[PDB]
Amino acid sequence: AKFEDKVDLYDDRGNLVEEQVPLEALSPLRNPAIKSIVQGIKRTVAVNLEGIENALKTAKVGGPACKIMGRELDLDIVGNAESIAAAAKEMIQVTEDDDTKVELLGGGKRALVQVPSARFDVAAEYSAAPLVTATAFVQAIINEFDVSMYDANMVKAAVLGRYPQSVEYMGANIATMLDIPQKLEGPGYALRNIMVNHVVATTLKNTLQAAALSTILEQTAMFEMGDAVGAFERMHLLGLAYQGMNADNLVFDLVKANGKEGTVGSVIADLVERALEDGVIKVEKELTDYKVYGTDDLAMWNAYAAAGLMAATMVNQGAARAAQGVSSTLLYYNDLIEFETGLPSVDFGKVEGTAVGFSFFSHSIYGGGGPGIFNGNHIVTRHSKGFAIPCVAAAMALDAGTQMFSPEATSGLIKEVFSQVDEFREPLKYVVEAAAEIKNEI
Amino acid sequence: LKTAKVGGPACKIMGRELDLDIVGNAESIAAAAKEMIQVTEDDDTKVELLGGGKRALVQVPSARFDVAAEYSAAPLVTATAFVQAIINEFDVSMYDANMVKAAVLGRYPQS
Amino acid sequence: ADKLFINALKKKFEESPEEKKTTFYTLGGWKQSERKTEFVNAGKEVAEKRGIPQYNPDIGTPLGQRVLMPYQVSTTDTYVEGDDLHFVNNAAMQQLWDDIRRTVIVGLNHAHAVIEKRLGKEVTPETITHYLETVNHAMPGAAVVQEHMVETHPALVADSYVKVFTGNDEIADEIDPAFVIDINKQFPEDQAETLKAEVGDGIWQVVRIPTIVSRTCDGATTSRWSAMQIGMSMISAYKQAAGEAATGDFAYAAKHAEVIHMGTYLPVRRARGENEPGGVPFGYLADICQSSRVNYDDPVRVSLDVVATGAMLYDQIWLGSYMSGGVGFTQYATAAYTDNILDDFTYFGKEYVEDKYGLCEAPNTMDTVLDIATEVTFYGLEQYEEYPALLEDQFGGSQRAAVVAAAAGCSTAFATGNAQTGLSGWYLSMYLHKEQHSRLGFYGYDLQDQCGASNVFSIRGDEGLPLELRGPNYPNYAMNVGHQGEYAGISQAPHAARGDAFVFNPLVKIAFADDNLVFDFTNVRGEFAKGALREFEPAGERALITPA
Amino acid sequence: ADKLFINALKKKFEESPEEKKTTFYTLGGWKQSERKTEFVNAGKEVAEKRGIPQYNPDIGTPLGQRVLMPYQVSTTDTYVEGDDLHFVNNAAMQQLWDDIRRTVIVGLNHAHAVIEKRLGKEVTPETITHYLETVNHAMPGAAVVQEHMVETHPALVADSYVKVFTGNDEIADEIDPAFVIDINKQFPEDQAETLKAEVGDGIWQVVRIPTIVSRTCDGATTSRWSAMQIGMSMISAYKQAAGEAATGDFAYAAKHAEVIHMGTYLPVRRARGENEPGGVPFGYLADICQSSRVNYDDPVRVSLDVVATGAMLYDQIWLGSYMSGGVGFTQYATAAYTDNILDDFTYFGKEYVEDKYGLCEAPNTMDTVLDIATEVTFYGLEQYEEYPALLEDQFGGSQRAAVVAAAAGCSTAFATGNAQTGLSGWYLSMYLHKEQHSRLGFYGYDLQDQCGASNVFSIRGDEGLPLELRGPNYPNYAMNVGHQGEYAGISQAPHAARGDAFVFNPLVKIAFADDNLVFDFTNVRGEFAKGALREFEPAGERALITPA
Amino acid sequence: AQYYPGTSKVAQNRRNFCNPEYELEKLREISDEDVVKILGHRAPGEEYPSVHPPLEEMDEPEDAIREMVEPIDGAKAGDRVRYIQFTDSMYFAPAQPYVRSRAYLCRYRGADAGTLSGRQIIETRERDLEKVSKELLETEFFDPARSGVRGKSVHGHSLRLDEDGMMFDMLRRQIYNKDTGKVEMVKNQIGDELDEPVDLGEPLDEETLMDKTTIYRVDGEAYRDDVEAVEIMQRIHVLRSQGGYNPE
Ligand code: F43
Ligand SMILES: C[C@@H](OP(=O)(O)O)[C@H](NC(=O)CCCCCCS)C(=O)O
Ligand SMILES: O=S(=O)(O)CCS
Ligand SMILES: O=S(=O)(O)CCS
Ligand SMILES: [Ca+2]
Ligand SMILES: [Ca+2]
Ligand SMILES: [Ca+2]
Ligand SMILES: [Ca+2]
Ligand SMILES: [Ca+2]
Ligand SMILES: [Ca+2]
Ligand SMILES: [Ca+2]
Ligand SMILES: [Ca+2]
Ligand SMILES: [Ca+2]
Ligand SMILES: [Ca+2]
Ligand SMILES: [K+]
Ligand SMILES: [K+]
Ligand SMILES: [K+]
Ligand SMILES: [K+]
Numbered sequence A: 001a002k003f004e005d006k007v008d009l010y011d012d013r014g015n016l017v018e019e020q021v022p023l024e025a026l027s028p029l030r031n032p033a034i035k036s037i038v039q040g041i042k043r044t045v046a047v048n049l050e051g052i053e054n055a056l057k058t059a060k061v062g063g064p065a066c067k068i069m070g071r072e073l074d075l076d077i078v079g080n081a082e083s084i085a086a087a088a089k090e091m092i093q094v095t096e097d098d099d100t101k102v103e104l105l106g107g108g109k110r111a112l113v114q115v116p117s118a119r120f121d122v123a124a125e126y127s128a129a130p131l132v133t134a135t136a137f138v139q140a141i142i143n144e145f146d147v148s149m150y151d152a153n154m155v156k157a158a159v160l161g162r163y164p165q166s167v168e169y170m171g172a173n174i175a176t177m178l179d180i181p182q183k184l185e186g187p188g189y190a191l192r193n194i195m196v197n198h199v200v201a202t203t204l205k206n207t208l209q210a211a212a213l214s215t216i217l218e219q220t221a222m223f224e225m226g227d228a229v230g231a232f233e234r235m236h237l238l239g240l241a242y243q244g245m246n247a248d249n250l251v252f253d254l255v256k257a258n259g260k261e262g263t264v265g266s267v268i269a270d271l272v273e274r275a276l277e278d279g280v281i282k283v284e285k286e287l288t289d290y291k292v293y294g295t296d297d298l299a300m301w302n303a304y305a306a307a308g309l310m311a312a313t314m315v316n317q318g319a320a321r322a323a324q325g326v327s328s329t330l331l332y333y334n335d336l337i338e339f340e341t342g343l344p345s346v347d348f349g350k351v352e353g354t355a356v357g358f359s360f361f362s363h364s365i366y367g368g369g370g371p372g373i374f375n376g377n378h379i380v381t382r383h384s385k386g387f388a389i390p391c392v393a394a395a396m397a398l399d400a401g402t403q404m405f406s407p408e409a410t411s412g413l414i415k416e417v418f419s420q421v422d423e424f425r426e427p428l429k430y431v432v433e434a435a436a437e438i439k440n441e442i
Numbered sequence B: 001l002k003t004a005k006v007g008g009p010a011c012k013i014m015g016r017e018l019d020l021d022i023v024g025n026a027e028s029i030a031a032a033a034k035e036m037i038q039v040t041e042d043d044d045t046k047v048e049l050l051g052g053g054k055r056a057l058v059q060v061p062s063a064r065f066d067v068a069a070e071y072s073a074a075p076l077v078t079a080t081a082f083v084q085a086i087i088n089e090f091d092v093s094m095y096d097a098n099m100v101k102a103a104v105l106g107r108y109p110q111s
Numbered sequence C, D: 001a002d003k004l005f006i007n008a009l010k011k012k013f014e015e016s017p018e019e020k021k022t023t024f025y026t027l028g029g030w031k032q033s034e035r036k037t038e039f040v041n042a043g044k045e046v047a048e049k050r051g052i053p054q055y056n057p058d059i060g061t062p063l064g065q066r067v068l069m070p071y072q073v074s075t076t077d078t079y080v081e082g083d084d085l086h087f088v089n090n091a092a093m094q095q096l097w098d099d100i101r102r103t104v105i106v107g108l109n110h111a112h113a114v115i116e117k118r119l120g121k122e123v124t125p126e127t128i129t130h131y132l133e134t135v136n137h138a139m140p141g142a143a144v145v146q147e148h149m150v151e152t153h154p155a156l157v158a159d160s161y162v163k164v165f166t167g168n169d170e171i172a173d174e175i176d177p178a179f180v181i182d183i184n185k186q187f188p189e190d191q192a193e194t195l196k197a198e199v200g201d202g203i204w205q206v207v208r209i210p211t212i213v214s215r216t217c218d219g220a221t222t223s224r225w226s227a228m229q230i231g232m233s234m235i236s237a238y239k240q241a242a243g244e245a246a247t248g249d250f251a252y253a254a255k256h257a258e259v260i261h262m263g264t265y266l267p268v269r270r271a272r273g274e275n276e277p278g279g280v281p282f283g284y285l286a287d288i289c290q291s292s293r294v295n296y297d298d299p300v301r302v303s304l305d306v307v308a309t310g311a312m313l314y315d316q317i318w319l320g321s322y323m324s325g326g327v328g329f330t331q332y333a334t335a336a337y338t339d340n341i342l343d344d345f346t347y348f349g350k351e352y353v354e355d356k357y358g359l360c361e362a363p364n365t366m367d368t369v370l371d372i373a374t375e376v377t378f379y380g381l382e383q384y385e386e387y388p389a390l391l392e393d394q395f396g397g398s399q400r401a402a403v404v405a406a407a408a409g410c411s412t413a414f415a416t417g418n419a420q421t422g423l424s425g426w427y428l429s430m431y432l433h434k435e436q437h438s439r440l441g442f443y444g445y446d447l448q449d450q451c452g453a454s455n456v457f458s459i460r461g462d463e464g465l466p467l468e469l470r471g472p473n474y475p476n477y478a479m480n481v482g483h484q485g486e487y488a489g490i491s492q493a494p495h496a497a498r499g500d501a502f503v504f505n506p507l508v509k510i511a512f513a514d515d516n517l518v519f520d521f522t523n524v525r526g527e528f529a530k531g532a533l534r535e536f537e538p539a540g541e542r543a544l545i546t547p548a
Numbered sequence E: 001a002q003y004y005p006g007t008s009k010v011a012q013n014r015r016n017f018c019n020p021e022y023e024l025e026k027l028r029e030i031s032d033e034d035v036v037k038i039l040g041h042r043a044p045g046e047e048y049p050s051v052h053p054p055l056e057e058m059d060e061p062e063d064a065i066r067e068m069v070e071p072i073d074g075a076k077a078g079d080r081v082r083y084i085q086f087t088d089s090m091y092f093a094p095a096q097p098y099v100r101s102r103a104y105l106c107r108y109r110g111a112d113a114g115t116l117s118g119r120q121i122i123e124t125r126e127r128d129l130e131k132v133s134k135e136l137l138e139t140e141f142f143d144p145a146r147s148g149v150r151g152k153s154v155h156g157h158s159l160r161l162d163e164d165g166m167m168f169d170m171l172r173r174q175i176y177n178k179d180t181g182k183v184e185m186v187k188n189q190i191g192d193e194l195d196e197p198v199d200l201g202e203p204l205d206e207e208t209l210m211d212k213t214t215i216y217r218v219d220g221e222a223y224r225d226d227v228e229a230v231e232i233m234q235r236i237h238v239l240r241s242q243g244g245y246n247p248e
Helices: A032-043 A049-058 A078-092 A117-121 A128-145 A152-160 A196-202 A207-224 A230-244 A247-258 A264-277 A298-320 A323-341 A346-360 A389-398 A412-418 A427-441 B023-037 B062-066 B073-090 B097-105 C006-012 C034-050 C091-101 C109-119 C125-138 C169-174 C189-199 C211-216 C221-237 C247-257 C282-288 C299-322 C330-334 C341-356 C366-386 C388-393 C397-416 C419-437 C447-456 C484-498 C506-511 C524-532 D006-012 D034-050 D091-101 D109-119 D125-138 D169-174 D189-199 D211-216 D221-238 D245-257 D282-288 D299-322 D330-334 D341-356 D366-386 D388-393 D397-416 D419-437 D447-456 D484-498 D506-511 D524-532 E009-018 E032-039 E064-068 E097-107 E126-138 E206-212 E227-245
Strands: A006-010 A016-022 A044-048 A101-105 A110-114 A282-287 A290-294 B046-050 B055-059 C070-072 C079-081 C103-107 C161-166 C203-208 D070-072 D079-081 D103-107 D161-166 D203-208 E081-088 E112-115 E120-125 E147-149 E174-177 E182-187 E193-201
Touching: A006 A247, A006 A427, A016 A427, A032 A044, A032 A117, A032 A207, A032 A427, A044 A049, A044 A128, A044 A412, A049 A078, A049 A110, A049 A152, A078 A101, A078 A110, A078 A128, A110 A412, A117 A128, A128 A152, A196 A207, A196 A389, A196 A412, A207 A230, A207 A247, A207 A298, A207 A389, A207 A427, A207 B073, A207 E064, A230 A247, A230 A298, A230 B073, A247 A264, A247 A298, A247 E064, A264 A298, A264 A323, A264 E097, A282 E227, A290 E227, A298 A323, A298 A346, A298 A389, A298 E064, A298 E227, A323 A346, A323 A389, A323 E097, A323 E112, A323 E120, A346 D447, A346 E227, A389 E064, B023 B046, B023 B055, B023 B073, B062 B073, B073 B097, C006 C070, C006 C388, C091 C103, C091 C211, C091 C299, C091 C524, C091 D211, C103 C109, C103 C221, C103 C247, C103 C506, C109 C221, C109 C247, C125 C161, C125 C169, C125 C221, C161 C169, C189 C506, C203 C221, C203 C506, C211 C221, C211 D091, C211 D211, C211 D299, C221 C247, C221 D299, C282 C299, C282 C484, C282 C506, C299 C330, C299 C341, C299 C397, C299 C484, C299 C524, C299 D211, C299 D221, C330 C397, C341 C366, C341 C397, C366 C388, C366 C397, C366 C419, C397 C419, C397 C484, C419 C447, C419 C484, D006 D070, D006 D388, D091 D103, D091 D211, D091 D299, D091 D524, D103 D109, D103 D221, D103 D245, D103 D506, D109 D221, D109 D245, D125 D161, D125 D169, D125 D221, D161 D169, D189 D506, D203 D221, D203 D506, D211 D221, D221 D245, D282 D299, D282 D484, D282 D506, D299 D330, D299 D341, D299 D397, D299 D484, D299 D524, D330 D397, D341 D366, D341 D397, D366 D388, D366 D397, D366 D419, D366 E227, D397 D419, D397 D484, D419 D447, D419 D484, D419 E227, D447 E227, E009 E097, E032 E126, E032 E193, E081 E097, E081 E126, E097 E112, E097 E120, E120 E126
Parallel strands: none
Antiparallel strands: A006 A016, A044 A110, A101 A110, A282 A290, B046 B055, C070 C079, C103 C203, C161 C203, D070 D079, D103 D203, D161 D203, E081 E120, E081 E147, E112 E120, E174 E182, E182 E193
16 A cells, blocks of 8 residues: 555444545545446436427527527427437447446436447547437437438537537537536546536435535546645545545534534534544644644644534534535634644645635625535636535535525436436445455555 | 746746756656556556656556546646656755746646 | 619729720829828828838839729718728727627526525516616716725716616516617517517616727626626615625626627637627627618518628628738628629529519428529629629629629528528539639638538538527638628528518517617618718727827 | 825825824715716716716715825826726726737747748848838738738828847847837846847847727737738748748748747636736736836836736736726725835835845745745734824725735845745735734635645646746636736846846847837836826727717 | 634634633623614514525435534524624724634534625524624624624725714714714614614723724734734744645
8 A cells, every 4th residue: 555544434324334444445546436436427418308309399499598480390309209219329339238328217308328438438538428429319319200401400409509609518408517628727627617516416415425426526636637646645535535435434423513503613623622632633832821733644634624624514504504604614614723723724725715715706796606506617616626615515415495596496407317326326335335345455 | 947948938037947957867757757657556657768868758547547537637647746756856945846847837827 | 674783883993884895004003092092191101200111002012003993882872992991990890899799688587586586575667777777877887885986987988888678568668768678669560579479578688888898808808897787786776785695696697697698709729708709600690780670671681781790790800800810801891792792693582582482482402402592693603794894893703702602592591481501502602603613712712612511401519500500610610701791691581581580599689679879780781881981980989088 | 204105195184194083974975076076977968968877976875975085106296086097097007908918929030941941032131121111011901912902091000010129139230220129228238138148049020910900809819910911021022922832831930839929818717819918927917017127226116017017907907897897996906006005015125125134135935934024014014003094095905915915025025036935925914914903805805815825835737836927817816806916016026136137038028118119118107197197198099080 | 722822912802702602791782673673684573584495394305414413493494594794993893804703603503704804794594693693783792883784885994983983884874972972873784774773882982992802903912012823823824835835
């Protein structure tokens, strides 16, 4: 092993599942469940057959409020969804009985599609998923109804929108969790451009699962970005484990102890006591009636602090059952813990900084929005390297209905399709079992 | 680095010059970079010197792309591994290390 | 009757228009031209003042060995030298673009839902009117909440304002009419009812930011500027905390969830933000042009007003400056809106269709394309052959290709009622023209036309799109003059023939039906003539804040 | 001596600056202000003319319950109301940006190699002069090869031209001097020899396209417009075919291989092409400002002229319009260039450094950062405490944070001769300020400052960069006022202290050392005052082609 | 918990505001009805509006975190999230902006706190906000001359005082009466007139303000002299710098 650290792994009810698992068994580079989740998200597409049908019958194609009078086509797509889906599958697959899926939902109104892995082996990136899916469904629909050459371009518009006049698939009736590569803030960012509401919807608002899926995506991106290479790798692995995988039951136990009456401040006090009990920090020197704490392990202090940050979000936004204050928790958990201890806050100030901007851009005229529309690729919330967005996912999971731009509003198509996939919906048990499987290979 | 000509055509920062014998120590730098670029020992990572140490061929391990969305891990993992290897080779100070970063990857992320 | 271009040809030349011979070289060179003479003198003055040589007729080759022609702006009696139709020299052309660039459409539907469902407050016609009075103070750059704010000079930003429209007539009539685009007044009955049915109970703002700001900045400024002042006016008018969590919902709604940009952003090689010309799809350009609601008994006039709008914007400003620059592409564009030439060819094609099929009654098939596009192409080319003065007028093959194919494509679409078969006719015209005269356009003119036939009906990712959705960023179309404005015309043609109130976006159609614009979008060619004569008054000038 | 802001405070208020009490509410509201009175009347005239309400003081809350202050433009004796420093109301500010936006630097080194190595023709100072005469005719939009070209009006484009520079003094002197930026005349001896050694035998064009075009279009137009007319002038001057295979090498060279844009393009969320403010790195902004070559015995003056340049461009025009809009961010920026406040704090810090370390002689270490940034932060904050009038003047916490940290950062960099430790000092200042007054800036002010300490010396992909290379698109910096222009100052500070001729790009430094610019980049604050007084004459106006 | 370093009175006051075990001094009595009036979100006797159904009626998924985290009463009821906002004079107001946000997230559950130079805000469920607001208004968080309840037009934290010692308010929500020596709240926090004004009592005297304040100033206790507090800030700067460079 490169690192000697071991962690105990728990389920989302706080029960011990695996003891003393090597840290690297949770690494995105090693853990086969993380690989399966990431590959799955790359290759999965939601197809709105009802939406395609309605766009065609009204000629409302090419984006908001657009319509071409005289171009209407009345096709019974939903009524013929089985045949269309089977025809599309024949085009999407590489070989019969490979890992292609095309599965109807909602009585034929939607389809879940998983494009075969073999197509991505010989692709540079991930756009084959929507593009292969789109043309397979365009062709299948044309063939189902013998749509004429003169009219077929309307089927194309109904499926993929204004592309390529627009750079995006503007008005498309397919959806993915990922967004187009051109919209990346930086190379390596693609797993960060996944809306918080999509993660929350997919995990059915289960708080710990939403946090886990978000942390998996964020910290996996940190590897793709090169941020978790060399000196920084252990910091990112310990963050993944303690903040998003409830390592050592620390998040769970902090929430248990602070859930009935607690505040951000009371979670801080318990976390600092635990860090001291476990030897992660110690008193370095004494000022007047003030103890200055130090650590010989900044990455582990950071990870403990990150666990407390997650617990503080769950306690504060959980008590309100309202997500908006997550921007405040992310700021003042970190501000308070520095002046409580004399140690640096989570991500060495970058969570606090992210929180400052996020607070501003969720309470002001200038941009942003509610917590659910942010993501790791958003200019407001890209700055912390994986330690902020998972708290936003937890907070939105806990929201009882205070948001206009809720997951129900923004993410219904994604919810219907992506929540079908067990590993997307409930990733934590899969990642924990996979860690157990490979523990002796580390 | 030795000219402080970093960040794009005709650019230079007077006073930031750093004179490091990178090519003369290329074997050690390459080996340190390889340790950071690989996922496991003897996986399909390559770091091979060319031109008397003036150039290196790098192949970033396949396993990193299995859990990546696209292909940018190749330059980004390579860049930071070489930045860190160079810093460690010469004990470049915290105050100067940002010049090594600029020399390797340029004006990114301003560009 | 005489061909529609005969008056223009008689004005331009000494010879009768059918004559094959003329006189060259003894015409006085640039001295034959009032405008070139103005330029020579101005160049001398410029160089003397600044100490660097500038315009000089003796540089390079000597202009005016042939007649330097006047051009008739089509549908007008105005004749001007071509320099007066250069966008740099024509304030009307500049203001057409500024009026598009500085406009965004922003819903109030999500905003009103935030107020009602999240804040728990009422929205009424009265609260909407109070909001509109507020935002018409704020939008040009003035304060409503903070102390010690410094503000834009109202006279510099007099062109900035906000209006609303809705399909609900009873709501529209209860809002102060100063702030309402009156669909029933601006549109004839059937078009008004179509448009109101599209909008329904929705309420939409048309926001125009100041020209002086749009010129200082860029198109991508518009929706941001709009949203800031919408946000401030929501705070002031609905009396909420001046910056609380709900404030972010108004921001997201105004900047993203219910915004309609005029143009979408462009990819890196031609990097641009929103509301730049390359992002404006052909169907939006046809809907911005307001000929449809005034000239609705003449589908040729409607279609060719759209062509003029697009030829100028897309070839002169967009391709000729944003994407290149210099002397640029004035006459590649003027070919499509001068001397009543495109008008002659297109009225011919419309008559052919009316006699053979009836408007909108031809089969939507390749047989129809082959028939109409071929016949109209041959008519247009015959005119250049029968009238040597016409051929010397539209001297560049590209100009001729665009004009002949525009007439062929529009005519085909008049017959089918479908823009896609119109587009197929445009490409067939090019192929026929190329074989007839053993030439077509400039070196790179027919990239898109050679790819054209195959991509008309394609359904593949970056190939397949109805014409209305295409624009200057459709891959094949991204580079070359003499196509984009003509495609906007073909997009318009079947809808004009059908009597449709709009081509692609009804909100865009309504948003430019506004007497408070600076440029008159109902009469684009009339405005180009006014600007050529130096009679157009643009917004955005700095005279008030500079020395007298 | 008196602190440098005391005169301004005495001019602004009735009370002495140390007094803690004043009078409110009885000042007449907006009627106390000449400028607000002008605006109220103009709003009424605007509404009457157009039939839509506009500026109205009775909307929202009532301005002027406190004194509406005049501001001294620092280094001047000009006092103006803040509205006169709004970029919309200040033609000098608009022209500063236009002069940057419309400029590109284009090499002739690849071009001359194509001529010699591919075409087989000689390049000499005489052929270069002939080429420059040609391109100074062509660049503003006039023809050199084709017949029947229509052209831009020379008087509308009088601000467009091309000059060259080279480090080779003999070549430079053999080219007609009308076309040459004379490095030896524009720069003091030491700076001139530095700059000539950087350029060497290279020959570079400085191309300025017309302001009227830049305003009609965007920044990404500039290098394209430049390249078209370079291309035409190469054809005319070196007598090749007017469009052969070699023509493409000149295009690629001028558009890509030897072009220097002022700004690089931006990512999609803030999509923009080249030569927009967000793409201009802090080191280029410092080099565009020309204070360095005239005020070279006063590093404070040089650094704070750069701060003025950047605070205006980056906060008022870029963040306050391109990225937002409305009333905008005038006073977030004016805090950094008015009332001699930042000047007082920075001269204090410079003297502390000279007394304790000597300029550029301090260890480049965190110990130096802790010393200087703490001392200067405490001095600046003490002034707000000692002088209640100062605190009421810079009433927003963000303004104070930016000003105090700018002095702290610049002072640290004066001591170390390194901008990175200067930057660390800026962030430490913020942290100390926040604890001292239990406040800092607006809701989102310290996103980048909280991330700041950790990212100063980071080497990770999107974190690590020398300050000179950072700019408005550095991720932490992409959103917020009160930082970017100050960072340009900190970038300048160590180089000013060292006596360096440039900060980051010597070609950019030389390119603005040109008396044929419209805006005077040697005296940015003087120009802002001139514009505030409505005494600045911008380029790009349309009066010549519009009614009188 | 130790909350904040330093040996000044300012530092101790900062610790006291943060410490939930520190019982805030009650300086004035404000009735429940007058808190509701000052807030201006609903009329007295108006039932609480609802942004969503009570938690019992909107069927949350099975979730251990939901089971362990007790919702505040206004969350149980589906109350709107509403706000109260204060401006604090730099002339020795007892509370100051970061002091408030730090203190609020130590003392109060379910809180969205925001800090700005001229305004500080808390957003929480309406009936809980009312209880919090009673404490914020009755105790030494508040002084009616040097602090103001302001939901908009907040200018004043950095302004000179008027002749009565009152902070500037563009909208004059709080009026000092020379004849009583008391401040009356004549408008609610958004600036709308109250039909019946609220007595806020007497302003604190100047020496008491200095005793209670949490701002450092040269004419009070200066931050630079509280060297132990400065030391910790500098330490954080250095350790953040190190960690960002290399956390190994
Ligand atoms: C509504 C917001 C929330 C938001 O998203 N932006 C606002 C308002 C916005 C508007 C105000 C225009 C108007 O009054 O109609 C504009 C001008 C931006 C625009 N839309 O053009 C602006 N702020 Ni604000 N805003 C400013 C500032 C500030 C300071 C003012 C504190 C004080 O004590 O006066 C505080 C933040 C803080 O407390 O630190 C602030 C808040 C706020 N700012 C509060 C309103 C505060 C109030 O109710 O009074 N701004 C400043 O600190 C100075 C610069 C000033 C900006 C205008 C300029 O630069 O000239 C203006 C910048
Ligand atoms: C955040 C982002 O907005 P969105 O969340 O994408 O709407 C971004 N605006 C800004 O950064 C506004 C910066 C200028 C105004 C605030 C200055 S502190 C933009 O419009 O691209
Ligand atoms: O001659 S080319 O076809 O290259 C250009 C025509 S403008
Ligand atoms: O009050 S906010 O900080 O949101 C905006 C300051 S302009
Ligand atoms: Ca097992
Ligand atoms: Ca005649
Ligand atoms: Ca000539
Ligand atoms: Ca009706
Ligand atoms: Ca009516
Ligand atoms: Ca009717
Ligand atoms: Ca005085
Ligand atoms: Ca007012
Ligand atoms: Ca000389
Ligand atoms: Ca010399
Ligand atoms: K209503
Ligand atoms: K512009
Ligand atoms: K020399
Ligand atoms: K309720």
